Design an enzyme around this catalytic site. Sequence first.
Site, PDB file in Angstrom:
ATOM      1  N   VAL A 162      26.260  35.210  64.689  1.00  0.00           N
ATOM      2  CA  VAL A 162      26.841  35.108  65.885  1.00  0.00           C
ATOM      3  C   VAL A 162      28.403  34.399  65.604  1.00  0.00           C
ATOM      4  O   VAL A 162      29.159  34.343  66.348  1.00  0.00           O
ATOM      5  CB  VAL A 162      26.353  34.171  66.735  1.00  0.00           C
ATOM      6  CG1 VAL A 162      24.984  34.762  67.063  1.00  0.00           C
ATOM      7  CG2 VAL A 162      26.037  32.650  66.167  1.00  0.00           C
ATOM      8  N   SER A 216      30.633  31.327  62.794  1.00  0.00           N
ATOM      9  CA  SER A 216      30.787  30.325  62.151  1.00  0.00           C
ATOM     10  C   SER A 216      30.339  29.218  63.075  1.00  0.00           C
ATOM     11  O   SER A 216      30.386  28.893  64.098  1.00  0.00           O
ATOM     12  CB  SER A 216      32.078  29.984  61.483  1.00  0.00           C
ATOM     13  OG  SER A 216      32.086  29.195  60.352  1.00  0.00           O
ATOM     14  N   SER A 246      27.138  28.861  58.658  1.00  0.00           N
ATOM     15  CA  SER A 246      27.124  30.140  59.297  1.00  0.00           C
ATOM     16  C   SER A 246      25.931  29.961  60.195  1.00  0.00           C
ATOM     17  O   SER A 246      24.967  29.518  60.110  1.00  0.00           O
ATOM     18  CB  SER A 246      26.999  31.184  58.519  1.00  0.00           C
ATOM     19  OG  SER A 246      26.133  31.096  57.527  1.00  0.00           O
ATOM     20  N   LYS A 293      21.683  27.244  62.201  1.00  0.00           N
ATOM     21  CA  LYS A 293      22.541  27.227  61.391  1.00  0.00           C
ATOM     22  C   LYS A 293      22.268  26.871  59.869  1.00  0.00           C
ATOM     23  O   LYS A 293      21.569  25.783  59.602  1.00  0.00           O
ATOM     24  CB  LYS A 293      23.810  26.017  61.724  1.00  0.00           C
ATOM     25  CG  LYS A 293      24.888  25.635  60.932  1.00  0.00           C
ATOM     26  CD  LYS A 293      25.992  24.998  61.513  1.00  0.00           C
ATOM     27  CE  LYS A 293      25.384  23.545  61.799  1.00  0.00           C
ATOM     28  NZ  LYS A 293      26.416  22.573  62.131  1.00  0.00           N
ATOM     29  N   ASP A 334      29.125  20.079  68.767  1.00  0.00           N
ATOM     30  CA  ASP A 334      30.120  19.807  67.603  1.00  0.00           C
ATOM     31  C   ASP A 334      30.771  18.450  67.767  1.00  0.00           C
ATOM     32  O   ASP A 334      31.945  18.497  67.921  1.00  0.00           O
ATOM     33  CB  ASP A 334      30.953  20.829  67.513  1.00  0.00           C
ATOM     34  CG  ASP A 334      30.453  22.472  66.940  1.00  0.00           C
ATOM     35  OD1 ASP A 334      29.272  22.375  66.396  1.00  0.00           O
ATOM     36  OD2 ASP A 334      31.130  23.274  67.246  1.00  0.00           O
TER      37      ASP A 334
HETATM   38  O1  RO6 Z   1      27.241  25.751  65.783  1.00  0.00           O
HETATM   39  C1  RO6 Z   1      26.408  26.060  66.722  1.00  0.00           C
HETATM   40  N1  RO6 Z   1      26.876  27.138  67.698  1.00  0.00           N
HETATM   41  C2  RO6 Z   1      25.995  27.473  68.617  1.00  0.00           C
HETATM   42  N2  RO6 Z   1      26.529  28.731  69.552  1.00  0.00           N
HETATM   43  C3  RO6 Z   1      25.813  29.121  70.719  1.00  0.00           C
HETATM   44  N3  RO6 Z   1      26.059  30.106  71.388  1.00  0.00           N
HETATM   45  C4  RO6 Z   1      27.508  30.861  70.848  1.00  0.00           C
HETATM   46  C5  RO6 Z   1      28.393  30.529  71.874  1.00  0.00           C
HETATM   47  C6  RO6 Z   1      29.779  31.414  71.658  1.00  0.00           C
HETATM   48  C7  RO6 Z   1      29.439  32.855  71.434  1.00  0.00           C
HETATM   49  O2  RO6 Z   1      30.768  33.560  71.236  1.00  0.00           O
HETATM   50  C8  RO6 Z   1      28.388  33.252  70.588  1.00  0.00           C
HETATM   51  C9  RO6 Z   1      26.939  32.356  71.087  1.00  0.00           C
HETATM   52  N4  RO6 Z   1      24.772  28.429  71.068  1.00  0.00           N
HETATM   53  C10 RO6 Z   1      23.876  27.153  70.352  1.00  0.00           C
HETATM   54  C11 RO6 Z   1      24.839  26.684  69.089  1.00  0.00           C
HETATM   55  C12 RO6 Z   1      24.403  25.450  68.451  1.00  0.00           C
HETATM   56  N5  RO6 Z   1      25.183  25.371  67.152  1.00  0.00           N
HETATM   57  C13 RO6 Z   1      24.720  24.257  66.377  1.00  0.00           C
HETATM   58  C14 RO6 Z   1      25.426  22.848  66.337  1.00  0.00           C
HETATM   59  C15 RO6 Z   1      24.825  21.718  65.477  1.00  0.00           C
HETATM   60  C16 RO6 Z   1      23.799  21.947  64.615  1.00  0.00           C
HETATM   61  C17 RO6 Z   1      23.270  23.382  64.421  1.00  0.00           C
HETATM   62  C18 RO6 Z   1      23.915  24.465  65.377  1.00  0.00           C
HETATM   63 CL1  RO6 Z   1      22.990  25.965  65.459  1.00  0.00          CL
END
Ligand code: RO6
EC number: 2.7.11.24
Length: 342
Positions: free
Chosen positions: A26, A28, A33, A49, A164
């Site tokens: 999805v 970065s 990633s 992630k 974030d």
């Molecule tokens: O980096 C992250 N991105 C997310 N994106 C979306 N949705 C995106 C929004 C933008 C769109 O273009 C694609 C989907 N949902 C939850 C996260 C959570 N997330 C995160 C934060 C801290 C630790 C671990 C993680 Cl995975």
Amino acid sequence: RPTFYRQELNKTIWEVPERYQNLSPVGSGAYGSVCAAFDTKTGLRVAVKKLSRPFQSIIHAKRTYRELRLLKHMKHENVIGLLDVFTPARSLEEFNDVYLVTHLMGADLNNIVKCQKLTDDHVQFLIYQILRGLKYIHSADIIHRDLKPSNLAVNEDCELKILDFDDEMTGYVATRWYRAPEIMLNWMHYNQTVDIWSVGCIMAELLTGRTLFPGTDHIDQLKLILRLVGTPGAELLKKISSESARNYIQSLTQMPKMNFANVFIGANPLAVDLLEKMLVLDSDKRITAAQALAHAYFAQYHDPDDEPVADPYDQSFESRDLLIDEWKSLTYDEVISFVPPP
Ligand SMILES: O=C1Nc2nc(N[C@H]3CC[C@H](O)CC3)ncc2CN1c1ccccc1Cl
């Protein structure tokens, strides 16, 4: 210990528990990633992630610990929290990768509201949730520091979550437009109120569809800010501990604060009043999240009994200097002791 399977996702080999299926990139994430996936055990769409080289250095290893510690602490509806954390490693000795799992959000605010003026009711609801999450975050003595539309994710129901928690800060860039002047220009030790400044900027933009302070650079941005809120008075100047910064501020022609009713023409008088209380130059005088929630603008959403505070957050590790393997072992303990939320 669950069984893990391997998959290559964009030249990257991901090894995750079988419960996670249909991994799809999805984009970065902060230092890693992210893949959207489906957690067959909970039925939740999640974002996974995989951290990139979590322990390549002391700085990275401590950042990995920091992120895990913060994410493991955050348990609030309007803040991204952790659903799972895992490593395919069977022992500390083999420990090299960390995967973080969270709810999958639909889009970030930026991509939804870009160039668009929102209705007052929608602004009320989006800002209310940001402040509710901020009250929680601030009650734990945590400061977000980088609140901006791109760090606010929303689902189809406008349900909002804060996430974030330099070349990239240079120029005509949204990475700097929502920063409080005291942190943008390093004026003094800043407090949690830097986050309220960011909310005011976001709120103004939702109301007008236009960036509030779209500076072409740090100085152009400060000028845009002072033209609106007025140049600082003697009282604030004394608080700018950076003599260099204080001295530059003093070189600007004095300007009185503008009338926000004439800047935000047609806006709800109560939105106007709240903006004036958030966009106060002196951070000591800005309204707090807890106080803003009680402001009449949020009358249709405020509920003192449904705006929780956080448990105490021990960040004493921030002042600790440890070796990579010590940060790595502390991170491992946190991964191994993780307990999923109900
Ligand atoms: O980096 C992250 N991105 C997310 N994106 C979306 N949705 C995106 C929004 C933008 C769109 O273009 C694609 C989907 N949902 C939850 C996260 C959570 N997330 C995160 C934060 C801290 C630790 C671990 C993680 Cl995975």
